[PDB]
């Protein structure tokens, strides 16, 4: 009765992704983990799946945050129209952002990162801000957003992620007068765009590391838990921050991102740094008690997975797409041969941490 999630390479490697403070190390909801040159900087190590900025510019405004950010601070404009995408142009006459992922690979080549996310993070990281006058450079780096549908890399020029309150922003034209319109992050699952928001520091070191290293996906048929008395005990709704009923599985996914205790670096009332600590993990499951589905947000770092049919364990960082647990460790797992009946037996192996049963004939 040792814990295989701590013990075994296949299981450990997986469970490691679900220490957010260690693998991400910053606010998720708002990521303002670093500071540079007297500013706040998006710093988090893991990329964030489904994150987008909802805006509250008036209806006439396009209200997309991937729009070219407002180019010349306009007087007759209040609030200031546009989005967050860097609006600069190359000498070529080509827009700095967004860029195709195609364009990236050709120019990046073999030496460059494999993942397109890696590739786009590196675009952002690669970028140096310069003053044409007084030739001056900055080490300040901006967050990228990657659209997985269309395969475009956007570099933003707006590290802000949340703006709230009528002293500072306008909701829906009101109070008119104010330059900035309110915005807040939201996990969104359109079929038309598929966004991933990240720090440019995903690209620092090895840009493809997230893939192996981060809680990128939702897990199907499993529940976060601590390991007690030789077995994995699902965090129960009693030590959860909130465990309200939740209509469906995708609803739980959005709730974790937004819930009021999720790791977040936004200013209270002052540059708060969460280090990733907060209600970031949630269990979705059907209560055996009056059978109402529950979304169970926790702040406890799980160290194992309790497997259960039809369950889903989500995190504030990860995708909405479900994915299997590892069933075995290739390295350690001895192939087991079932009883030879009919001169044929099923034989079970561990190709890529999953059971492939392939039936063989003993005689």
């Amino acid at each position: 009765g040792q814990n295989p999630w701590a013990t075994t390479t296949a299981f450990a490697d997986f469970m490691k992704r679900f220490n957010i403070p260690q693998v991400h190390g910053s606010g998720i909801f708002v990521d303002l983990g670093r500071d540079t040159e007297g500013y706040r900087e998006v710093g988090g190590k893991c990329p964030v799946f489904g994150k987008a900025i909802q805006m509250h510019q008036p209806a006439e405004y396009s209200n997309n945050f991937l729009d070219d950010a407002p180019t010349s601070n306009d007087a007759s404009k209040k609030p200031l129209p546009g989005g967050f995408n860097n609006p600069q142009v190359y000498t070529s006459g080509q827009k700095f952002s967004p860029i195709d992922d195609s364009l990236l690979q050709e120019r990046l080549g073999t030496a460059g990162p494999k993942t397109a996310i890696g590739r786009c993070a590196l675009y952002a990281y690669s970028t140096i801000a310069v003053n044409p006058s007084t030739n001056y450079t900055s080490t300040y780096k901006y967050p990228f957003v990657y659209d997985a549908v269309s395969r475009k890399c956007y570099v933003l020029s707006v590290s802000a992620q949340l703006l709230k309150g009528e002293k500072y922003c306008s909701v829906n034209g009101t109070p008119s007068g104010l330059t900035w319109a309110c915005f807040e992050p939201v996990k969104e699952k359109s079929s038309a765009r598929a966004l991933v928001y990240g720090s440019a520091f995903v690209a620092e070191g090895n840009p493809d590391a997230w893939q192996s290293a981060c809680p990128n996906d939702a897990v199907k048929d499993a529940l976060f838990g601590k390991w007690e008395d030789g077995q994995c005990v699902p965090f129960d709704t009693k030590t959860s921050v909130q465990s309200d009923q939740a209509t469906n599985k995708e609803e739980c996914w959005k709730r974790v991102f937004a819930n009021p205790l999720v790791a977040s670096d936004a200013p209270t009332t002052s540059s708060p740094k969460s280090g990733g600590f907060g209600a970031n993990w949630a269990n979705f499951y059907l209560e055996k008690e009056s059978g109402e589905t529950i979304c169970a947000i926790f702040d406890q770092v799980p160290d194992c997975f309790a497997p259960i049919t039809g369950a889903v364990a989500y995190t504030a960082l990860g995708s909405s797409t479900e994915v299997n647990l590892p069933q075995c460790d290739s390295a350690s797992f001895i192939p087991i041969e079932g009883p030879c009946n009919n001169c044929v037996q099923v034989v079970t192996e561990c190709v890529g941490n999953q059971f492939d049963q392939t039936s063989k004939a003993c005689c």
Binding site: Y39, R40, V89, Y90, A129, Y168
Partner: peptide, 30 residues
């Protein structure tokens, strides 16, 4: 002012240009 709070929300006034070694061009605000 209040804009103490806006910098403290991640707001930063960009610089006119960028250099990118992947494209090896200078991109500037039009």
């Amino acid at each position: 002012d209040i804009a103490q709070f806006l910098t403290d929300s991640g707001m930063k006034a960009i610089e006119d240009c960028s250099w990118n070694p992947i494209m090896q061009q200078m991109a500037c605000v039009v």
